[PDB]
Amino acid sequence: HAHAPKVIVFISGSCLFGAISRSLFKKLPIPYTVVLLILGAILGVVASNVPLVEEHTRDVAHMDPHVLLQIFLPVLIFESAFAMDVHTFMRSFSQVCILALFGLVVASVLTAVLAMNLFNYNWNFSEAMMFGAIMSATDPVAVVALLKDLGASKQLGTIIEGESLLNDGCAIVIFNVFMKMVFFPQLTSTVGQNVLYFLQVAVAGPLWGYAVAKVTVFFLSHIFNDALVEITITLAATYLTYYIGDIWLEVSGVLAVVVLGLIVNAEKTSISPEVEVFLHRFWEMLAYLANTLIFMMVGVVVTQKALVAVDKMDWFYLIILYLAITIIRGMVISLFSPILSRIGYGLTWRNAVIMTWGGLRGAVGLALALVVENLAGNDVIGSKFLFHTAGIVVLTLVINATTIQTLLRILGMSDISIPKRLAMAGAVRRIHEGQNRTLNMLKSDRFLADADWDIATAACEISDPYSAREFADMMEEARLRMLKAEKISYWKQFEHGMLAREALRLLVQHAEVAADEKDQFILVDDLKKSWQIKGIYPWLKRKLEDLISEKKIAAIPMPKYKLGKLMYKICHHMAFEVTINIAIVLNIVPIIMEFVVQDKSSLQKIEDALRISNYVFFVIYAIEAIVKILGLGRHYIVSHWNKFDAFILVVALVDIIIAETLLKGSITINLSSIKVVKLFRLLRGLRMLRLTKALIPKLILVVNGKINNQLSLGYDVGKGYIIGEEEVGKIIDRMVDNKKILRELKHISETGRLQVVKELGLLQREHPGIAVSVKTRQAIRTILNHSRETIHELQGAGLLDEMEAHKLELTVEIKMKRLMNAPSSIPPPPPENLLKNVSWLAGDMKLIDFIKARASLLHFDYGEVIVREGDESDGLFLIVSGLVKLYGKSEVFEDYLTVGNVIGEMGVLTKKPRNATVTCETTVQVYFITAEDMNIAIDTFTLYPSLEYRLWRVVAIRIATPLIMEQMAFQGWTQEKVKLHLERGYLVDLAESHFQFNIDATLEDVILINGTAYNAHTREEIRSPCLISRTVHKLTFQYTATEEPRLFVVR
């Protein structure tokens, strides 16, 4: 009607003042919060002198204390929790928890006892404990930001963040408890209520937060391309969680918010790839506003109140307090120096000193002091709290925030690594060369010809910010060369996207650890590359116990008596359990009310209906029984779980007619339900316990998910190691000059590669269900990623405009998000599907049927021999299940093969004796296809994509894949881009031999696989299995009945 709020102007003024202060104090080490405090002091003095601005400032000067506790603190707490790195924090759970909790408790108790002893104020223990809890909360954002800028010791930053978060939460909880104890006394209570109160404060919070987080995460995974809905529902969930936890029920709110934020941050994958950026920015700006407002408020309030009643001697006390709060904390670290030395990452004296000097008090202590001062109404309390808190905050901000950089430099942590320095030098050299080339190109233009050339310095040069016995040499230099080669290979794999993140982090960590270690090659595979592959814990035992618990007979016959099949199918339908579950969950309502009435015309209608409630459900259960028993015969009792259904009904009736409604005898006088009923019969609730039967399969899904995550991590690590080792091998082969070093290096590479391959094969054999799901997800991802790259290239080429490309990209990301919700387990495909999927015969059905007609199944026990070296070719073998070890002479190469591999192709195609004896590592089932049968098939099928053609194309690709690596001279083709590029090429038909094959730009490079060739320049004869380089221009075929000449080109 006549509204004119005066709170917007103050928040906007503080907003602008903070913006100016932050912008101005950028290069200077002094934080802008001191400037904010000074500005608040000036504003408070002015408002005291001038009533006009006092009319606007009194709204926040005497602001209600509860808003500080119930709005500002939760916002800062949730903002701190959200920006966390969940994985690194999880990797240091016990250390952070123990350190934070015990240090907080010890510091609070010691500060409290010092406050009672040293200070002359007559304080009891509760107020002293409140004081300690106020001055035991830290927020060192500056220290962790500086450490991240330095780019080293991420563990220190993670530990600092974890300790700060836990300290803030626990300090707030302790302060709340003790403030309620002090300012609002509530008679006396026994230990019975005290234990319940402690349990409600401690445990009931995190459980509620975890439940809400799980519910909202589940609901967040079914929303597609709706950013607004996701953001709005997340905000609503957070606000409702805090409000319900802290108001409707008396549980703690900060802990629930912390747990919810941590859980949501852990499962950020379900969040669409752009929402979390908006959420992070929103929470950051909210925290910034809260900090600015809190600082201005404390400045004004202290400037008035503390300076009304400040004592000269008090200042002296403050000084000692500072020493105390900078000593005890450090002592705590010393008191825990060895305890966490053997647990987790560990600690060192330099890190301990940095941690001790890195504790800066923040806005939490100021808010608590303001609340305490507002609640009190005298001088001995509230004035002293605020004065001491403000003094401590100012002292810490002035001293530590400015001396931390010098302390870091002294301690030898500001140095720059030589590899980083030389990499930066190379990068800036690259940049200068590119800039010079571009400038030389632009000047030669016709339009931008006479432009002024002051851009040469306007664009400037990106200068380096840093500025400023006969064998061990080659041994060490070759070692570091493998380290850089492995690191760049892993980085390239990441940039492609196949290596994920955690696997890359583990690989690079192992690499640099073994590099800094003295004389041992990285990735010895003994233990450092073993835990992730293993992933062993009673997950599998719990899974097996659940499956054996949920067991049933295969099938029940259908008697032709009565209707038979109709009644049987109506009893066995999923609708049956759907309605029984619905009836139970809607029985939770009546069972709740009677209990309510138990713990308690309205009562008349309550007893009229409630009784109607049981007299209908009982009949419904009876109706189920006649269906679940009849058509099942005795089976009624065969299912050991279903026996529970008989009991529920028997108890129901037995305690409804013989225990209730007495008109014949039975209990009569006995003090049973007749005079009871209010109890005993209430057991109706037992009806709820019946759900478990359907609840058991749900836990299997979560166990499968955990095992799936572990298996995926192990597979990614193994793949990455294998790919890095091959690339590193082809690099070292040409880079190194000496021979003995090269042979040793290749030995150490090959041993580890073979061990990892065998371990991965054994693991895949041990867990069949989830391996199939893992392989499927990685393929769908790889395929979708390549499709997205192709779409982007097509849009860039100009054939497609912007909106169609955007639509197709949206479709692709929707498909990826749908993939992300894939089932955790997939049953293994049958041998028929395995035979069908094989590439060189896939597609048409006639050839598939012809092959399936004659392909015998062979079972081989462990430790047998399938194929002997030097034996004539007889056929192939399709590994359906198991592992096989191939040993052969080429350098005596060895290998391991698994499901989906075929080994007969070379011999069956070129009529040559076998060259590799294969033995079996486990029991193995194989598919044997006779050589005569294959000859008949290849003679029968002679279409354009003939069987002969397809087999030779597969063999040619396999043979020619390693050869290109040679021509690769440090070009980094990643072994995958070459495979793709080669897949584009096809095998040409040598219809005529008198012709001469020409070469040109379209066909690039060509490779010969079978036959022989002669140069068209100097009559140079060349055999089949070799490259031809480029020095040839024309290829001359010839008539040779000994071997068929095969040519495979790429265009």
Ligand X SMILES: CCCCCCCCCCCCCCCC(=O)O
Binding residues for a 1,2-diacylglycero-3-phosphate: 3
Least distance in angstroms from the C-beta of 489 to its own copies: 7
Which CB sits closer to its own copies, 821 or 1029? 821
- Candidates 402-410, 435-443, 572-580, 1018-1026: pick the segment binding its own copies (CB under 8 A): 435-443
Q: Is residue 865 classed as helix, strand or coil in its secondary structure?
A: strand
Binding residue positions for 3',5'-cyclic GMP: 904-906, 914-915
- Number of residue whose CB is nearest ligand X: 290
The pair of structure tokens assigned to 943 is 């279409």
- Candidates 335-343, 523-531, 735-743, 768-776: pick the segment binding its own copies (CB under 8 A): 768-776
* Residue 808 found at the interface with its own copies (CB under 8 A): yes
Which CB sits closer to ligand X, 235 or 423? 235
Which CB sits closer to its own copies, 546 or 750? 750
Q: Is residue 880 classed as helix, strand or coil in its secondary structure?
A: strand
Residues at the site binding ligand X, with contacts judged by CB under 6 A: 7, 11, 63, 67, 71-72, 75, 286, 289-290
CA dihedral 838, 842, 848, 854 (to 10 degrees): -20
Least distance in angstroms from the C-beta of 521 to ligand CPL: 46
Which CB sits closer to its own copies, 64 or 433? 433
Site residues for its own copies, window 964-983 (CB under 8 A)?
Answer: 979-980, 983
For residues 235 and 882, what is the distance between their CA atoms, to the nearest angstrom?
Answer: 51
Q: Is residue 965 classed as helix, strand or coil in its secondary structure?
A: helix
The pair of structure tokens assigned to 501 is 């993140």
- Distance from first CA to last CA of the chain, Å, rounded? 79
How would DSSP label each residue in 375-417? Answer: H--SSTTTHHHHHHHHHHHHHHHHHHHHHHHHHHHHTT-S---
Residues at the site binding ligand CPL, with contacts judged by CB under 6 A: 170, 173-174, 177, 181, 185-186, 188-189, 193-194, 197-198, 201-202
* Residue 791 found at the interface with its own copies (CB under 8 A): yes
- DSSP 8-class letter at 1025: S
Quick one: what does residue 1002 bind among ligand X, ligand CPL, its own copies, none, with the CB cut-off 5 to 8 Å set by partner type? none
For residues 523 and 489, what is the distance between their CA atoms, to the nearest angstrom?
Answer: 15
Least distance in angstroms from the C-beta of 79 to ligand X: 10
* Residue 442 found at the interface with its own copies (CB under 8 A): yes
Least distance in angstroms from the C-beta of 999 to its own copies: 24
Site of tokens 């009673």: 538
Binding residue positions: 3, 904-907, 914-915
Candidate residues 29, 434, 697, 945; the one interacting with its own copies per rule CB under 8 A: 434
User: What are the φ/ψ torsions at residue 925 (nearest 5 degrees)?
Assistant: -110, 130
* Residue 443 found at the interface with its own copies (CB under 8 A): yes
Contact 729, 489 (CB under 8 A): no
Which CB sits closer to ligand X, 22 or 635? 22
Contact 274, 227 (CB under 8 A): yes
The pair of structure tokens assigned to 119 is 């200070």
Quick one: what does residue 459 bind among ligand CPL, ligand X, its own copies, none, with the CB cut-off 5 to 8 Å set by partner type? its own copies
Quick one: what does residue 15 bind among its own copies, ligand CPL, ligand X, none, with the CB cut-off 5 to 8 Å set by partner type? its own copies
Residue 161 has, within 13 A of its CA and on its CB side, a CA count of 26
For residues 964 and 610, what is the distance between their CA atoms, to the nearest angstrom?
Answer: 82
Least distance in angstroms from the C-beta of 10 to ligand X: 9
Contact 711, 767 (CB under 8 A): yes
User: How many Cβ atoms sit within 10 Å of the Cβ of residue 709?
Assistant: 15
Contact 1035, 996 (CB under 8 A): yes
Candidate residues 59, 64, 250, 284; the one interacting with its own copies per rule CB under 8 A: 284
Q: Where are the alpha helices (DSSP H) in 411-560?
A: 418-443, 455-458, 472-496, 502-516, 531-534, 539-549
Q: Is residue 92 classed as helix, strand or coil in its secondary structure?
A: coil
Contact 296, 42 (CB under 8 A): no
* Residue 429 found at the interface with its own copies (CB under 8 A): no
- Candidates 392-400, 785-793, 849-857, 1007-1015: pick the segment binding its own copies (CB under 8 A): 785-793
Candidate residues 149, 470, 516, 801; the one interacting with its own copies per rule CB under 8 A: 801
Candidate residues 28, 468, 797, 845; the one interacting with its own copies per rule CB under 8 A: 797
Which CB sits closer to ligand X, 14 or 400? 14
* Residue 780 found at the interface with its own copies (CB under 8 A): yes
Least distance in angstroms from the C-beta of 766 to ligand X: 54
Alpha-carbon dihedral sign for residues 157, 162, 165, 171: negative
Contact 961, 974 (CB under 8 A): no
Beta bridge partners of 1026: 1008
Site residues for its own copies, window 831-850 (CB under 8 A)?
Answer: 833-834, 837, 839
* Residue 913 found at the interface with its own copies (CB under 8 A): no
Which CB sits closer to ligand CPL, 252 or 708? 252
Quick one: what does residue 897 bind among ligand CPL, ligand X, its own copies, none, with the CB cut-off 5 to 8 Å set by partner type? its own copies
Least distance in angstroms from the C-beta of 511 to ligand CPL: 39
Candidate residues 691, 696, 754, 772; the one interacting with its own copies per rule CB under 8 A: 772
Candidate residues 185, 193, 269, 450; the one interacting with its own copies per rule CB under 8 A: 450
Burial of 57 (0-12, 13-18, 19+ CB in 10 A): buried
Least distance in angstroms from the C-beta of 125 to ligand CPL: 11
- Candidates 227-235, 544-552, 599-607, 697-705: pick the segment binding its own copies (CB under 8 A): 227-235
For residues 791 and 808, what is the distance between their CA atoms, to the nearest angstrom?
Answer: 8
Selection from 545, 164, 150, 173 nearest residue 358 by Cα: 164
Query: Starting at the edge strand that comes first in sequence, how are the strands of the sheet with 865-867 ordered?
Result: 865-867, 916-920, 884-888, 894-897
Site of tokens 């597969």: 954
| Distance, C-alpha 417 to centroid of its chain | 30
Which CB sits closer to its own copies, 82 or 89? 82
Q: What is the size of the binding site for its own copies (CB under 8 A)?
A: 113
Selection from 823, 814, 819 nearest residue 701 by Cα: 823
* Residue 118 found at the interface with its own copies (CB under 8 A): no
Which CB sits closer to its own copies, 281 or 640? 281
* Residue 437 found at the interface with its own copies (CB under 8 A): yes
Quick one: what does residue 177 bind among ligand X, ligand CPL, its own copies, none, with the CB cut-off 5 to 8 Å set by partner type? ligand CPL
